[PDB]
Amino acid sequence: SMNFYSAYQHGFVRVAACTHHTTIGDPAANAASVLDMARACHDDGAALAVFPELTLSGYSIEDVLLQDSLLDAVEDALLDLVTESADLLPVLVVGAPLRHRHRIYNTAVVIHRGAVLGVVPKSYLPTYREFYERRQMAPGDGERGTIRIGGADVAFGTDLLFAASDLPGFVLHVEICEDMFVPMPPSAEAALAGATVLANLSGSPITIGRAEDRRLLARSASARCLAAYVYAAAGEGESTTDLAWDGQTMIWENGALLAESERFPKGVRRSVADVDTELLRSERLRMGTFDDNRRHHRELTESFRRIDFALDPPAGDIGLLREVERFPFVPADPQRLQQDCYEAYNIQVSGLEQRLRALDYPKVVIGVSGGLDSTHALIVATHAMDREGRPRSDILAFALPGHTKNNAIKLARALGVTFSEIDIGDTARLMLHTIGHDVTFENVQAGLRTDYLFRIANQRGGIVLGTGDLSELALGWSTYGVGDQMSHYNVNAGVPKTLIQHLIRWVISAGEFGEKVGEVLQSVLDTEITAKVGPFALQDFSLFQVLRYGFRPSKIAFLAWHAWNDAERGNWPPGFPKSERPSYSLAEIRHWLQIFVQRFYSFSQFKRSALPNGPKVSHGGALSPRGDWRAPSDMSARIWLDQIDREVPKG
Amino acid sequence: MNFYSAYQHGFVRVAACTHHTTIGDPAANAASVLDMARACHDDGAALAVFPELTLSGYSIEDVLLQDSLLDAVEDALLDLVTESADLLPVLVVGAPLRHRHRIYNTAVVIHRGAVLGVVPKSYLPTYREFYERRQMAPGDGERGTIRIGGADVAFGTDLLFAASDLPGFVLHVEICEDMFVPMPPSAEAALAGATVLANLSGSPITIGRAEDRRLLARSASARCLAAYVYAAAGEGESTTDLAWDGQTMIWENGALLAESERFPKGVRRSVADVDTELLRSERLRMGTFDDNRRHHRELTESFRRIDFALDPPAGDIGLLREVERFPFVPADPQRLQQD
Amino acid sequence: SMNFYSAYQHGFVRVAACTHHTTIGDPAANAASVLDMARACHDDGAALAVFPELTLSGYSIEDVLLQDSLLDAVEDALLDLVTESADLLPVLVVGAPLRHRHRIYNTAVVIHRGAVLGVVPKSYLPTYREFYERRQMAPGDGERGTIRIGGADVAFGTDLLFAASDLPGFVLHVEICEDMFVPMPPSAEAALAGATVLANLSGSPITIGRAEDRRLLARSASARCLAAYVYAAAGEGESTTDLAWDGQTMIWENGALLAESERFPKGVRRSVADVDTELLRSERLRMGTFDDNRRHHRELTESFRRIDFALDPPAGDIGLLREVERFPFVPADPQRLQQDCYEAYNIQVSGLEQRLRALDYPKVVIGVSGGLDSTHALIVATHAMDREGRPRSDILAFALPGFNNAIKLARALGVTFSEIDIGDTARLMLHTIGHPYSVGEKVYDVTFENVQAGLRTDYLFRIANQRGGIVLGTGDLSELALGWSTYGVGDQMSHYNVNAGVPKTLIQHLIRWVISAGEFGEKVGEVLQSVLDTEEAKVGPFALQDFSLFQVLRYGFRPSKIAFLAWHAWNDAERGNWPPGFPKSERPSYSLAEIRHWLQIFVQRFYSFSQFKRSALPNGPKVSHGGALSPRGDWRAPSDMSARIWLDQIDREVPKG
Ligand SMILES: Nc1ncnc2c1ncn2[C@@H]1O[C@H](COP(=O)(O)OP(=O)(O)OC[C@H]2O[C@@H]([n+]3cccc(C(=O)O)c3)[C@H](O)[C@@H]2O)[C@@H](O)[C@H]1O
Ligand SMILES: Nc1ncnc2c1ncn2[C@@H]1O[C@H](COP(=O)(O)OP(=O)(O)OC[C@H]2O[C@@H]([n+]3cccc(C(=O)O)c3)[C@H](O)[C@@H]2O)[C@@H](O)[C@H]1O
Ligand SMILES: *CC(=O)CC[C@H](N)C(=O)O
Numbered sequence A: 001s002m003n004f005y006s007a008y009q010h011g012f013v014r015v016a017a018c019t020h021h022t023t024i025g026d027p028a029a030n031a032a033s034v035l036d037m038a039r040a041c042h043d044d045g046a047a048l049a050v051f052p053e054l055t056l057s058g059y060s061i062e063d064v065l066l067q068d069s070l071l072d073a074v075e076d077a078l079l080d081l082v083t084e085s086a087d088l089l090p091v092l093v094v095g096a097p098l099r100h101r102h103r104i105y106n107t108a109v110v111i112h113r114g115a116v117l118g119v120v121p122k123s124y125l126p127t128y129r130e131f132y133e134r135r136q137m138a139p140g141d142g143e144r145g146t147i148r149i150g151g152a153d154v155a156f157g158t159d160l161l162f163a164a165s166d167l168p169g170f171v172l173h174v175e176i177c178e179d180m181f182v183p184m185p186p187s188a189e190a191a192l193a194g195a196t197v198l199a200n201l202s203g204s205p206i207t208i209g210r211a212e213d214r215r216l217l218a219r220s221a222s223a224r225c226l227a228a229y230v231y232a233a234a235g236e237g238e239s240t241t242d243l244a245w246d247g248q249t250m251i252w253e254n255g256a257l258l259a260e261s262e263r264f265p266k267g268v269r270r271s272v273a274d275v276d277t278e279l280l281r282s283e284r285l286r287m288g289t290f291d292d293n294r295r296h297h298r299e300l301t302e303s304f305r306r307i308d309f310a311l312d313p314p315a316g317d318i319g320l321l322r323e324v325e326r327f328p329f330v331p332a333d334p335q336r337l338q339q340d341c342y343e344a345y346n347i348q349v350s351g352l353e354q355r356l357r358a359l360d361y362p363k364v365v366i367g368v369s370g371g372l373d374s375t376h377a378l379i380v381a382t383h384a385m386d387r388e389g390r391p392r393s394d395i396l397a398f399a400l401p402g403h404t405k406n407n408a409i410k411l412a413r414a415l416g417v418t419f420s421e422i423d424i425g426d427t428a429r430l431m432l433h434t435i436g437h438d439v440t441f442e443n444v445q446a447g448l449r450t451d452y453l454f455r456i457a458n459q460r461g462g463i464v465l466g467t468g469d470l471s472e473l474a475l476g477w478s479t480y481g482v483g484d485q486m487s488h489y490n491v492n493a494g495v496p497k498t499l500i501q502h503l504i505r506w507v508i509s510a511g512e513f514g515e516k517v518g519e520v521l522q523s524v525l526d527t528e529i530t531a532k533v534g535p536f537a538l539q540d541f542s543l544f545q546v547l548r549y550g551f552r553p554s555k556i557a558f559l560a561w562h563a564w565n566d567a568e569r570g571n572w573p574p575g576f577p578k579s580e581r582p583s584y585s586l587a588e589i590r591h592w593l594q595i596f597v598q599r600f601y602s603f604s605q606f607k608r609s610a611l612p613n614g615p616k617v618s619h620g621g622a623l624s625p626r627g628d629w630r631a632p633s634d635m636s637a638r639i640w641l642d643q644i645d646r647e648v649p650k651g
Numbered sequence B: 001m002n003f004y005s006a007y008q009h010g011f012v013r014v015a016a017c018t019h020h021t022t023i024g025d026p027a028a029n030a031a032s033v034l035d036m037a038r039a040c041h042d043d044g045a046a047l048a049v050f051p052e053l054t055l056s057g058y059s060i061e062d063v064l065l066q067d068s069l070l071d072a073v074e075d076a077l078l079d080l081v082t083e084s085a086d087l088l089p090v091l092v093v094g095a096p097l098r099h100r101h102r103i104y105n106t107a108v109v110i111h112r113g114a115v116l117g118v119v120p121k122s123y124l125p126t127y128r129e130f131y132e133r134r135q136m137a138p139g140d141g142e143r144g145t146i147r148i149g150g151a152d153v154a155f156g157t158d159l160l161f162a163a164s165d166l167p168g169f170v171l172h173v174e175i176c177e178d179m180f181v182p183m184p185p186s187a188e189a190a191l192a193g194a195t196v197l198a199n200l201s202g203s204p205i206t207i208g209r210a211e212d213r214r215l216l217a218r219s220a221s222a223r224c225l226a227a228y229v230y231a232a233a234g235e236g237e238s239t240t241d242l243a244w245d246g247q248t249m250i251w252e253n254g255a256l257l258a259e260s261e262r263f264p265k266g267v268r269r270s271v272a273d274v275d276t277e278l279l280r281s282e283r284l285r286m287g288t289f290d291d292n293r294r295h296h297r298e299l300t301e302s303f304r305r306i307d308f309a310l311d312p313p314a315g316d317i318g319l320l321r322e323v324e325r326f327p328f329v330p331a332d333p334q335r336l337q338q339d
Numbered sequence C: 001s002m003n004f005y006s007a008y009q010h011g012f013v014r015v016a017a018c019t020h021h022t023t024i025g026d027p028a029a030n031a032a033s034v035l036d037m038a039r040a041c042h043d044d045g046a047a048l049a050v051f052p053e054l055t056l057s058g059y060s061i062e063d064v065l066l067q068d069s070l071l072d073a074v075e076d077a078l079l080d081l082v083t084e085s086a087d088l089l090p091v092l093v094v095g096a097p098l099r100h101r102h103r104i105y106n107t108a109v110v111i112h113r114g115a116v117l118g119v120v121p122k123s124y125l126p127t128y129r130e131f132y133e134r135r136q137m138a139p140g141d142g143e144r145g146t147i148r149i150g151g152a153d154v155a156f157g158t159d160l161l162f163a164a165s166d167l168p169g170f171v172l173h174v175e176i177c178e179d180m181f182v183p184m185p186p187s188a189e190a191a192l193a194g195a196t197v198l199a200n201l202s203g204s205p206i207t208i209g210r211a212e213d214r215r216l217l218a219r220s221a222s223a224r225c226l227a228a229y230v231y232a233a234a235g236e237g238e239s240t241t242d243l244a245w246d247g248q249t250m251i252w253e254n255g256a257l258l259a260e261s262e263r264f265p266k267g268v269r270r271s272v273a274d275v276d277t278e279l280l281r282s283e284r285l286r287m288g289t290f291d292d293n294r295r296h297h298r299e300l301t302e303s304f305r306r307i308d309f310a311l312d313p314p315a316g317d318i319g320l321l322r323e324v325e326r327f328p329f330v331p332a333d334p335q336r337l338q339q340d341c342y343e344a345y346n347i348q349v350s351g352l353e354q355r356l357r358a359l360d361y362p363k364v365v366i367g368v369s370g371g372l373d374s375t376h377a378l379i380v381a382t383h384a385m386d387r388e389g390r391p392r393s394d395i396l397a398f399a400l401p402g403f404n405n406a407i408k409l410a411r412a413l414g415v416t417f418s419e420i421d422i423g424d425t426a427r428l429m430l431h432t433i434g435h436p437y438s439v440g441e442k443v444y445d446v447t448f449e450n451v452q453a454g455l456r457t458d459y460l461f462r463i464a465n466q467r468g469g470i471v472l473g474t475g476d477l478s479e480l481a482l483g484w485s486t487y488g489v490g491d492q493m494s495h496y497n498v499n500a501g502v503p504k505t506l507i508q509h510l511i512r513w514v515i516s517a518g519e520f521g522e523k524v525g526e527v528l529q530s531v532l533d534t535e536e537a538k539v540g541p542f543a544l545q546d547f548s549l550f551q552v553l554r555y556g557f558r559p560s561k562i563a564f565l566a567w568h569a570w571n572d573a574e575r576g577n578w579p580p581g582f583p584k585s586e587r588p589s590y591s592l593a594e595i596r597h598w599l600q601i602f603v604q605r606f607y608s609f610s611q612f613k614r615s616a617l618p619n620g621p622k623v624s625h626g627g628a629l630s631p632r633g634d635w636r637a638p639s640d641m642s643a644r645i646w647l648d649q650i651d652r653e654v655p656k657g
């Protein structure tokens, strides 16, 4: 049905921020540069191309802006670019000084397929320090109605929206430079009114620290407004009478940098990026206070003129111009990952500390298998007790038998907790014979482990620490009730499996426990990293897409297939030797995804529904029915399986 | 004149339906809705009100925010709309729908191949067992239009649906909690000229809650000189934390016309013939009704009026109404004794 | 420090609805009646006295209302009422035809301690059937400003509020008869604006069916507005030229009837009642859609004028003119209780049915002890299976003896019964754990108890896995409330809990109801009867802890409020009503000391100790309008909190005996 490989068909929109070569006072030369860059955007299958402030005239020309021949030439060049846009795909947004009523305004001219769609005046004209804009130009705020551009009255003003009738997640607002620097930017209101993609044309002469100011405000704009922010500054060609120009271009999306270009380039540059319109749709759907803010400013947000146009974007394979991280829960950037780990660890630990204070410092009872989960849980328990001034011997670690085991006893001893072994085999057998008895034997044991721990907890003034992690909660990979699903407080509940290993190796690298302790933990890593329905790399990927954005299955398959299909494309996080770096085909992704939707939406909720306490960890979510995930325990996943059948190719 | 025609005598055949909900499965909800609407059509009915969030299931919590859920809701809606081309009654069907930034708790009014309007729930309970503001936006103060499969249809809380060939039939829709607030959307709608008030309800069943539904639906109808048509969710809604009784009922000016079995096994319909002339006549005589309108002129004059033609049956289709032999002498013994 | 026995000090307000003797055309005489009834209200410590429409003239005097001497007589009778109210405690609300600008208005004069607070014209004048009010009277809808009464300009119009300054939960709004019959009543907007007590003055000539109409609309107003509604109609003395009067008076609170007087009385009558202003406060506090409605009509609601007065109510013991039931979950009225039970039962059954449909009809594993709870859950599970067309033998019931009723019921029902002796496994576990009992020591501590409790659950869960079933929860709401259960492995844990939303006090009555319906038959009836007759005294009487549960769960009332209520309900066994099924013997009274003691235990256990077991709760339906305790639903709280402030409120506010 759908062309699976089409970014557009997956709700992406391609955008370009362009920096052209300026020829100050020569609009025909500026236009030829623009047209050439636009032709490259067209070839890239871009929906949108933003150029710098006053593109057609040059920003830096001062009183030359007031010359009849300057203004006339600007107009003629403009008409030719509109004629030339008949055969171009993208909306072009080009800056121009245009006469309207008494003055010239600093405008962006929004151009698509042989017509001008609208003309947006700069709202705020800096008349301070190096800037002199009120001398030549009129402010645009409050101006409405229309402007005559080549025998056509087109919308004119700061209340304008350019909505694609065939791509409803793409709604464009345009503002100009200084417009984003003021306490109440025009783009803020345009976001509340429906704009999803915010364009900024800049001149912006460059100064020590100014690129940092542009970033601060483009970034936070994109985050606070749940939007893409597309930004172009002026470059080479501009006058250096008093200023210099760096040509910076950048594309932001909900606080995250999608693309940015070389500063001080020799020649023209572009940022091109695929903006995920569903990601924006998803954040807005969920943050109700965004809409609350709209209704508060209802008169202000309801008067925008919506201007429709049809994009007819390309339907075929044009690749994906986007970084798609293999591990949404594990950033491939080392400094970023180090920070993620520091926070995850301190979250779990402080989550436990409070519990423990509240219970007047119980013993901590914990089943330890030599596994990644219970190991890391033990560390957390230990640091918590240390921080609270509590004897590590009040941690009661139990091996509960019915290889990896050796690690458990080593770590316990290395840390100096209280270690003990209870053999559950005979209770297991008594139970099995009483019941009238593979699968079965394993349930009885897992159950009895929990049973003993809970009873030991009763006996010794303790609480049972849970050890199951987020990925297991997600998939229903636990024994429910009397089983490892149950505890008094679960420290690993909000930590996905893909992140646990990284957390342990963070603790090792911190090395604040012993050198002895580091050795046993490294051993755990080596023994353990070498639950069989899916690689957790894949199921944690899908978990993120669902928990955070509620994305559809085919949308998930596409992103994962882009992140995972080629082993040597994109980045990997640290602690991955080149022989532990796998590929997954679409068929693989599709298979594991079918299992995912079935187990996540239908099978597993009842287990999450009666969940012990524990802290949320990841911006991506947790799975607490008191927090991030309210769902029925009694629902089919037919809908999602059906979506897979119809939308995702078998190979 | 066809003497034996209920329609020609100023009656409107109205139906409140409780379907079988399959949570998170819109196509199956649309199947249960379509089946029941054909039954209504056969009965010569002019209106079929279904439960809150008919197409999704009311009780699915954050599954409401899942993209595949919403896509399937919309595809099911479009198919329902397509099927009504041949169906006599106006269908009033709940759906979670995207508009602007959020999803709304909506009722979609469907007649003969087209959508007539889309009505957001005004007040979203977010207390006790209700969590509606977490997933859904308030509809109060919303106007303008909404894009439903290639048409821009009216969207908002100020809509009236008037049968151009049956003037006593003027339809207003509100949703569950909308009738429980001091100043219901429907009280203003009646002053504006609505004679038939629909309510789609989710309404998890609790000890006493049917008495509450009763009191407010009956007192609404009496206070507003209207028929009031109520339909609650039943079997199929998630029982993770709640139970559902699928109550449906039809009031007219304080009188109960029809009601269905609570906790039924299977689908149930209340069906009743509303005397629009009764309503007309009480309105004509009670001047203080219209005085109240004039006091809230701006409120009541702003309502938008969508016209449709019913083309109801001409013939003898019986009369789904209890007409007492002695208007002055109640047949019910307890009531007669009170009198 | 408070006077614990003062209803005023617990957030009550005493309201009175009065019907007086009409002498038509004779205000001095209507005044004299009013005054006499006002003094009786004062004596009763009432803060409000509402009289019938046009109290001072007679409602039915028609064009006599246009007579100069009538109008003059009225005005002088009012000024005299006002002078007398100097020494009266209640706000008086009194009907009168009054001259303002070009006309006479059908007004309500709100009077208090020697001053008029405000005059409220009838918004809406019926001029149809037997009513002709537009002929003599002008509409009040949307008039404002002031009116001169006895040398004072006083608020006049339909947007007035009388807010008591020493009684913040008493804010009065007044309307008049037909005002409450129109789609958009004056008083609906005034409730949004902040009125807690809605007064209505009626003439209301009586007619077949009309008293039901008054009730339908005053009751639903009180319900929809989260308000008290105080209603008074004219009776004897009105003109019977074309009409008759029944002098009906009534007080509604939030949809409930507080009081009502005799219809067609010989002589004057009053409904006096204590309105709980905290019940109203708590209800408003929780239904945010009420506030959402106010913000939607912000212009309407913010326009209101607020007039203050110091009520200065009596500080002492003046009783409680209120019916406080012993069992908030168990209505004393037997047809009401029959209704609750029908509903409880069908809620439990349908909830479980849906669970079973959803899992393609698993087997049903249930631990049966012969107790009330498990007995009831078995019955519920049997009905679920029947309704779904599933064999009763797919219920797998287990007696689990540790260190007759169940087996008899199981066999009578025709379910699959089995005994599993947990003793040997308990022994083995206690030894493995090194418990003193495994070496002979009679240490019957929590672990000893829990090892057994836990093993019962462990067994059932493994049966469930082995046999393709689900374990039914058996614990009831009162146990969830107190944490009287074994957490995690044990008791507290199941695949689906049918009794989760049902409090203990309600359970026996459900069984009674099952026997009465007779649907299961003679033998089942008999065994169930037997279970009732054969069938934790350190958490206190469940009757007391359910009383406390309701106040906290529904209203969040402070502890001294709950003590007050419980004491009033439970102090004297011979006073008030009991539900069906309490033989005279089975009828305890509780002292303040008893009530206080168990409340201390409630707050500690409920707010502090027990939340953690509630926090990881299996699925099950909510049952009671009082609330349920699911952490995904009615009760969201921390698992790590102390109850210090509640225990401290008890020390300061509740006398020790
Ligand atoms: N919607 C629903 N509502 C209420 N109950 C429902 C239910 N769906 C199934 N059930 C019931 O719940 C039970 C099924 O749940 P459960 O008892 O968990 O059993 P189940 O999920 O079938 O098995 C869990 C499996 O995962 C693996 N596991 C287990 C324990 C720990 C780990 C680990 O992380 O190391 C892995 C192991 O292979 C084990 O057999 C049955 O009694 C079934 O009847
Ligand atoms: N806030 C908190 N967060 C996490 N864990 C917490 C905790 N507070 C205590 N804990 C832990 O939980 C455990 C205490 O809870 P739990 O295991 O329930 O033990 P506990 O509540 O101390 O005792 C249960 C008691 O309830 C009574 N009961 C139970 C079952 C049935 C019946 C009947 O009459 O039929 C009566 C009986 O007297 C029994 O001994 C301890 O291990 C404690 O450390
Ligand atoms: C974008 C622009 O007009 C230059 C930057 C602005 N004046 C600023 O405040 O930094």
Ligand SMILES: *CC(=O)CC[C@H](N)C(=O)O
Binding pocket: B175, B176, B177, B180, B201, B202, B203, B204, B209, B212, B213
């Ligand atoms: C929706 C309805 O009509 C009755 C239930 C409602 N949610 C309530 O009682 O609060």
Ligand SMILES: *CC(=O)CC[C@H](N)C(=O)O
Binding pocket: C126, C177, C178, C179, C181, C202, C203, C204, C205, C210, C213
């Ligand atoms: C006093 C009054 O308005 C009663 C008339 C009312 N419409 C009624 O009882 O029907």
